[PDB]
Structures are given as C-alpha cells and as structure tokens.
Amino acid sequence: EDPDAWLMVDEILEQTKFLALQVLDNVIMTRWKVLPREQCQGIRNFVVQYILQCSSSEESLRTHRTLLNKLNLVLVSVLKQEWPHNWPTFINEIVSACHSSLSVCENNMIILRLLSEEVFDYSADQMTSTKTRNLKSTMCAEFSMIFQLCQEILNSATQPSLIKATLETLLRFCNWIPLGYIFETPLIDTLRTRFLEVPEFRNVTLQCLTEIGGLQTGGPGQPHTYDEQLIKMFTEVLTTISNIIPLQMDLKATYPNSNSRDQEFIQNLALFLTSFFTMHLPLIENLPNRDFLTHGHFYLIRISQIDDREIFKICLDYWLKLVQELYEEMQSLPLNDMSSMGLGMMSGGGAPNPALLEHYPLRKHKYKEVLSNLRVVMIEKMVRPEEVLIVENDEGEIVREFVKDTDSVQLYKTIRECLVYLTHLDVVDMEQIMTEKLARQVDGSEWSWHNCNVLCWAIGSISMAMNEETEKRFLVTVIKDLLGLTEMKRGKDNKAVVASNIMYIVGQYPRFLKAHWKFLKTVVNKLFEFMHESHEGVQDMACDTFIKIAKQCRRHFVALQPSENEPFIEEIIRNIGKITCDLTPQQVHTFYEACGYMVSAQGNRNQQERLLAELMAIPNAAWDEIIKAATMNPGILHEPDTIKIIGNIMKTNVSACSSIGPYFFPQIGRLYNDMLQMYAATSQLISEAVARDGEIATKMPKVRGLRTIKKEILKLVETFVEKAEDLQAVRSQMIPGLLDSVLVDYNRNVPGARDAEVLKAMTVIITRLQGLMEDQVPAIMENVFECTLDMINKDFAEYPEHRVEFFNLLRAINLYCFPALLKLDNRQFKFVIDSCMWASKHDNRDVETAGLNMCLELINNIAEKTDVQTCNAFFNQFFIRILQDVFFVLTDTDHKAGFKTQSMLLMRLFYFVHPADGSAPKIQGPIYQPDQAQPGTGNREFLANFVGTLLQNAFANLTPLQITTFVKDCFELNTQYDKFRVVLRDFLISLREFAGDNAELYQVEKEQQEREARAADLERRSKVGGLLKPSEL
C-alpha cells in the first residue's frame, strides 16, 4: 500500500514512479473508508511536502512540470473526498504560501484552478438556480480572502506565468466571487490598464471581463445597482478595443490569414459583446452619447461578416434575440387596435408601411443605420433551403443531394426568422437592397453562382412577410429579371442554377399567382422547359415545384381564365405525354399527383369523372394492353420489364388516388376486378415456382418481382380504402372479393411466399371500416392467426416486418372490432396475450410502446365494455399473467422507456380491485385466480401479499413496512395518475442500480413541456407573417 512509493521517488534511477502515482490515485478513488486517520493525515502531509521540495526554484518548476501536474491531479482527487468534510485551513495555508515565494504562489493558483475545474464542471450544468448561489454564499468569507490574493498578486506580479495563471484562476472563480466585492474594488481598472493591452494577457483578461458582463444582477436594488459601473466598464473597454482594432481593417479577408490565438480573441470579443448586450442592453440605450451602442453593433456586424460557423452562430443568436425584442415592441402597440380601419398591423401577417411609424418614439430607430447593414450581411450569409435539391460540389459539377446535417437546417430556420423580422422592421429598405442586388446580378456583373444563389434564397424565404401589393410589384420585377437570366445565360450549370432559384421562389409564392394568372401560366411552361433539360435534379425540382404550386393554387386551373379559351387542365391533359417524355417514373408519379390535386379541385361530379378518365387514359390503356397480354399467357408477368411497368402504373394510380381522395371510385371500379385476377395469377405462379425449385425459389429475382407486383396492388387498395367516404359500398363491393382473393392464398402459401403487406391491408381496412369488418373477422383469423405464429416460434428474430404488422393488426382489431373479439377460441387468446407480452420484451422503443398500449386498451375494453362474469374470468387468468409480466419488465434495467405506459397499466390493474369512489364501492371484477394457488378468499390482501413476495426478489434492503406503505400508496392513488406514477418513479430512483441507471422515468413530464413549448412558439410565430411556411398552414 505505497510504502514502496516513498522509497521509489528517491532511491530509484522515471515512468515507473509516475505509474505508481497513478496507482495511488486510482486507489484513493477506489478506497477511502479503509484508511486509518493517522495515515490519511500523513499522506496529505507527505504529498504536500513533496510538492514543496520542487517549488522554491522556478528552474526546478519548469524541469518537473509533468510530475507537478500528476501531483496536483492526485491532490484534487483526494481533495474532493476530504475537503468538504473539514478543511478551511488549506485556503489560508495557501494564502500564506503565496506570500512565501513566486513559485509557490503559481502552484497554488494552478491548484485552485484545478479544484475549481473539477467542482465547477459539476456545478455549471446546474443552471445555478438555488444551489450555486448557496454554495457561493457559504464560502463567501474564504472567497474574499481569495480575492485579496488574486488582486494583490495581479498588482505585484512581473512574471508572465504568474500573471497568466492568476488570470486563469480569476476567470474560473468569477461567478463564485461576491458581486459587490468585485464591483466596489478597482479590479476592472487593473484588468483594463495593464493586461488587456498586453497581447499575452489580453485573451484571458477579455474572457474574464466577458464573464463579469454576463453576470446576472437578479437584484437591481437587492444589493446595489451596478448599472453605472458596468457602463464605465463597457465604454472604456470599447475605447481600448477601438484602439486595438482599426476602423478601416477588413475582418473578412484578414481572419483566414490569422493564427489560433487571434481567432480565439475574436471569438472572445463576440462572446463579450453578445453576453453584455443580452444581459444589460437598455443601459446603453438610455445613454446620451449613443456612440457606444452603434459602435459595438458595428463591431458585431464586422465580426458577423467573418466566415466561421461558430462565431456566426453566436452573432446569429444575439441578432435574433435583438430583432425579436425590437419587433415585439411594435407588436405591443395600441395601433393594433386600429387594424379595422386598415391602419396598423393585423395580428396575422403583412408588414406595415414604415413611414406610418417614424413619428413614434421607438427603440428601433436608435439602431436604424445598423439595421440597414445587418440585413445586407444576413443576405450574404444565407444558406441553401430545404426545397433546393442541387448544390455545386467542391470539384465543380452541379449535383443532387438527398439530405443535409440537422445543424445546417436549424441554422436555416434561425436565419429565415431573422430575415423575416428585419423585413417587418422596414419592408421598403429591404426591398431596395434586394432590388439593387438583383439588378446587379442581372446586369451589374456582380454575378457569381454564390451571390445569385444566396440572393434568390433570401427572396424566396421572405414569403408572406410583405403585404400583397409590395409583394406583387417586387415579384413582378424579380420574375421578369429571372426569366431574362434563364434565357440569356447558357450552359447546363448556369441554367441549372437560375432554374433552381426561380423554381424555389415561385414555389414559395402561391398567393401572388392566385391573383395574377398570366405569370402562373408562364412559370408553368418554364417548369416544363426545365423539366426537359439533361440534369436529373432540375427535373426533380420542376416536378416538386409543380406539385407545390398545384397543391396551393389548385382551384385556378379548373376555372376558366378570361385570357384563355379553355381550362388550363384540359390543355395539360392533351400534351401530357410530350411533357413527361424525359421523366423518370417517380417524377411521372409526382406529376400525376399534382394533376390529381387539380382534379380534386373540381366541384362538378360528372366533369370530375371525365377529367379523371382522360387523366388516367395512358396508364389505363397501358394497363389494358398488359391485361390482354398476360391473359394470353401469365408467363409474361414474371418478366423484369412487365413487373417494373405494372409497378409504375400502380404507383401512378397511388399518387393520383392520394391527391384526389374520395372521388377516385369511378377509376378504381374499372381496375378493381382485373387486379384481383392478376393477384390470383401471380400467387399461382409462385406456388408453381416453389414446387419446381423448392422453398429457396423465393430468393430468385422472378418470385421477388411477383411479390413486388402484389405489394404494389395492395398499396393501391390501401390508399383508396383510406380515402373512401362511402364505407357501406366499399364494404359491400370491395371487401368480400378482396378477402376472397388474398386470405386463403395467404394461408396456403409457404412462409417464404407469405407477405406482410396483407396484414398491413387488413390493419388499414379494419381501421377505416371499424365495426363493418366484424362479420369478416373470423375468416381473417382462421387464415392468418395460427400460421403466422409458427413463423415467430421457430425463428426468434426472423420476419420482423411480419412481427410488427401482426402485432399492429391485433391492436387494430381489438381497438376497432372488440365485440367481434369475444368469439375467439380460448386457446387463441393465450397466444394473443403471449405476443402482446413479448411485444414489450424488446429493445425497440416504438413497438414496445405500441405493445403496452395494446395491452392497456385490451384490459380497459374488457372492463368497460364487457359483462362482469366475462371480465372476471378474463382476469381470473390474465390479471395474474399480465401483472406478473408487467412487473418483470418494469423491474428490469432495460425497457425503462416503456415506464410511461407501464405506470398507467399497473394503476388500472389496482383500479379494478379497489377504486376510490362509490357510495357502495364498485368492484370491476369480483372473483380472482384459481383456488390451487391459494384457497384464501380476498383480492386486496392476496394482491398485497403476492406483490410483496415478488418484490422481495428485487431488493432485500427494503423493510416489510416499506412494502406495506408502497402498496397502500398504490391503492389510494389509483384515481390520480400523476401522483401515482411520480411516487413509483421516486421509489424506483431509490434503488442503487436505478440510481446509476439515470432518469428515463420522466418521459411524460418531458412530453408536456414540449407540447406547451411548441404551442407557444407556434402561437407567437403565427402572430407574425412570414414565420409560417404556407404549407405549414
């Protein structure tokens, strides 16, 4: 036990002694109770002495720096255990030690910085609600001594290392030091005058000042009001900064040509300004000079210009907070009340004419000039929107990208928000800036892909912020200019960029087009032009922009425009093939979806039928051709070409049906019969393929194709069933034939052949139809239930899709077709329960959630919707089975996520035995489990006893009385969910393994706060136009 270490440090010879030190530290961490008091005191004594020996000479210090480092680490390690108990003296000892030699003082500072790092790291995540303040107040007296130390040290020092370490320590202790002690003392003057100017001390000095500025003064008068001191600090520091940084100096170009220290300094400056402004802004506003506010914000802009993601993130956050605070002032105006006259700003959207408010005494005007710059920079720092699918790769060529980092996306949202607020503050100057940049992009030869892109992205992203009129004018100019750019600039790249931008913009402005149809027509034809170009990305974006525009402005296409002789949709239908010539099938599907929206817009039923007919003319004709061909021989069906084609037709129909909805029935009835026959055919082809080539045949491409076909058909059927309005007809006409086609086949098919999409379909049709599938339910269970289960038993993990969809199917059945469920054979029920229980016994959170949900719905339905004898027998077996399993799962370290439902489930279980209401108490289920277990009659008593027996297994450290109280708590709190689950939660927390398990148990409490948060965010955002995307409405 380290006697050999003492001898080691001296007698040896150096890696080995360090290793021994690490063993020592690891042991002290490992053990603390075992040591005898004399030996603990002794080890502290000797470690202190050995520290002292190297100290007295700076040469020895620099020579032994690593050894000193490990020594200090061991010291802080022991310190965490020993110091909180009883060691005030150490601090004073350190005070006397710094007043001994320079070196000793340095080491002391390093030590303080280390201990502070170890404790403060633990306490800075705390948010400093109540705890950090109390700790501060308790150790205030010692901290004062520490201040006298740091201050006088700062005054006496001449050695760089001393000053540096001192400042580091001061930084670490800033929050903890009494604020009054800080402010009354001329510490600030000392920091500014000597060290801030010195390059070496400058960064750390600035970080300290930043921390002081950030310091919350939650009492304006509680101790004293420190606004006056802070103002002096900010002013003088700002002046010094002005001296350090040239006005003419351009940060953007300079910054890349800089080392780590300088960049870190700029970061420190941004953090400083942002922190101070965030916490104490009105102070500078009220100042008469006004120069410092504007100068600081100008610095903020210059720094914001710099191309660095971190710095820019900081600046951006502050800018957002500022512009929100400024805007909400306008929002809180009495002028809102005069919205009726047309005056002021509506609660909705629409930026007000800036001129109307210039006569007001408002904060915004103070920043007027600054704002005019900010917008520009915000335009310059705009990023690629969600909708845009193409980007120039580093190498050169334009390419298509599916998704981007979340970090980029949230950045986009924040920047958009800022741009919107800026636009609201002054729509005119905004319009002027964007118009200028636009004119330069078109003719001014300020042209670059980057500039054009960011400008256009900014333009599109301000939709609904501007009132319809200014928006109208501006958009007219923009559209003309971009069309000009579209035809003038050539080459795949240039045209791709221009087209992309114009498509995004027109995508973002539906309302303008609604009142100005000619532009709508023009941009549509231009979309087709873009569609025919070589690059796939422009095709995709053309189709997507088209579907957006169709979605928002569907009604106009059906209507007759005064300009045109016929409805535009009619024009589209005839030329549809020519348009879709170059398209990939997905693009085609999207197209047909948009057209589907347009068809959905039609109020006239017969015309709707006609339009739908002519719309599906091509897929229907192709379908008929294929039907004839397959009718002659179904061998053609098992050909890659045919499979892919049929799949395409099906997907097209899916898109169309998805957009049109309830009025798709004329189309489907036509196709419906032949689909069933195709389904039966393909299935039969599979049965032959397997018989010839064994069960392995399913792996081969042909069978995979057949299954693909069947799946597509089913997906179409599902879609239409979702959209249906006439449930009775669907039940009568579609369902029996559908089940006739799918079920017996599904049963007879081999496991390889069986497809989960059938189960998905059953789930969907039962979900929509509800109590009309009840008659058909026995047929489904007969053909599905027994065979599917055996696919789970033999193979534990296999057929996961089948697993999830089987369970979800059962959930749908019980949830929607309960009265039908009571007819099941008793044997099947146990399997149902087993599946339900396993569903919880899995690592996947979602399927588990669904499982516990299903069990809950089950027992609830048994209680509330069933006769008492049926229910009480049901519980006679399943109450015990379920309760047991639920407890097993809850008690496990894994499956913590399920707690949210688990909590409720138990609550219900107890609810059925002893409720908290009733003049004469109402028992949901009277009789209990079979006699062989216990002949002892009584529910509550047996429940308590049994729960105790199970609980003793979990943890034996519990008193029988603890169990007793817990059970009673469970019984009385069955009425209130929150209280019950909380008590259970804390009770679980008490356990050691659960203490180390952390807290997943707070799931519900997390959910509620996010619900309210999002509701608030959406509420304030709705109050401001532009913040809501049209599609999000």
**Count of structural domains, the chain:** 1
Measured distance CA(629)–CA(636) in Å, rounded = 7
User: In this structure, are residues 89 and 45 in contact, taking their beta carbons and an 8 Å threshold?
Assistant: no
Please state, as a whole number, how many other Cβ atoms lie within 10 Å of the Cβ of residue 989: 13
CA 453 vs CA 383, 473, 506, 619, 822: distances in Å: 9, 21, 14, 38, 64
Contact 99/148 with Cβ under 8 angstroms? no
CB crowding 516-548: b at 16 or more within 10 Å, else e: ebebbbebbebbeebbebebbbbbbbbbbbbbb
646 and 626 in contact (C-beta within 8 Å)?
yes
Token pair, residue 129, equals 């609600």
Distance CA 1033, CA 511 (A): 13
Residues 255, 406: Cα–Cα separation, whole Å: 27
Tokens of 683: 């299935």
End-to-end CA distance of the chain: 71
- Burial zone of 245 (CB within 10 Å; 0-12 exposed, 13-18 middle, 19+ buried): middle
Query: What would the 3-class secondary structure string for 939-972 be?
Result: HHHHHHHHHHHHHHHHCCCCCHHHHHHHHHHHHH
Alpha helices in 349-491 (DSSP H): 368-380, 406-425, 427-439, 449-460, 468-488
SS3 392: strand
Q: How many CB atoms lie within 10 A of CB 368?
A: 14
Cβ atoms 316, 408 nearer than 8 A:
no
∠ CA 597-599-600, nearest 5°, is: 60
Residue in the structure block whose two tokens are 């221009």: 498
Question: Helix, strand, or coil here: 863?
Answer: helix
In this structure, are residues 114 and 126 in contact, taking their beta carbons and an 8 Å threshold? no
Amino acid at 430: M
Cross-strand pairs, 391: 399
Q: What is the CA radius of gyration of the chain?
A: 37
Q: Are 509 and 475 in contact (CB under 8 A)?
A: yes
Closest to 987 in 3D by CA, of 1008, 958, 1007? 958
Residue 346: phi, psi to the nearest 5? -65, 155
Alpha helices in 734-821 (DSSP H): 735-748, 757-769, 777-793, 800-816, 818-821
3-class SS letters over 504-537: HHHHHCHHHHHHCHHHHHHHHHHHHHHHCCCCHH
Q: Three-class SS of residue 400?
A: strand
**Distance between CA atoms of 68 and 47, rounded to whole angstroms?**
11
Residue labelled with tokens 């039609």: 602
CA atoms within 13 A on the CB side of 224: 12
Range of the domain at 361: 1-1033
CA pair distance 847, 759, nearest whole angstrom: 16
Residues in contact with 235: Cβ distance below 8 Å, sequence separation at least 6, in sequence order? 292
* Cβ–Cβ < 8 Å for 848, 895: yes
Q: Which residue type occupies 683? A: S
Distance of alpha carbon 470 from alpha carbon 474, whole angstroms = 6
Method: X-ray
As given in the structure block, the two tokens for residue 56 are 């007295």
Task: Write the CB contacts of 704 (distance below 8 Å, at least 6 apart in sequence).
Answer: 698
Structure tokens at 848: 């588990």
Element (H, E) at 624: helix 617-632
Q: Count Cβ atoms below 10 Å from residue 696 Cβ, excluding itself.
A: 10
Asked whether 762 and 780 are in contact (CB, 8 A), the reply is: yes
In sequence order, the 6+-apart residues with CB closer than 8 A to the CB of 871 are 862, 863, 924, 925
Give the position of tokens 């914000």.
297
CA distances for 1006 relative to 203, 335, 406, angstroms: 40, 39, 21
| Environment class of 454 (CB within 10 Å of its CB; exposed 0-12, middle 13-18, buried 19+) | buried
- DSSP letter for each residue of 541-567: HHHHHHHHHHHHSHHHHHSPPSSSSS-
- Residue matched to tokens 């005191």: 41
Contact of 251 with 303, CB cutoff 8 Å: yes
Number of residues that this document lists for the chain: 1033
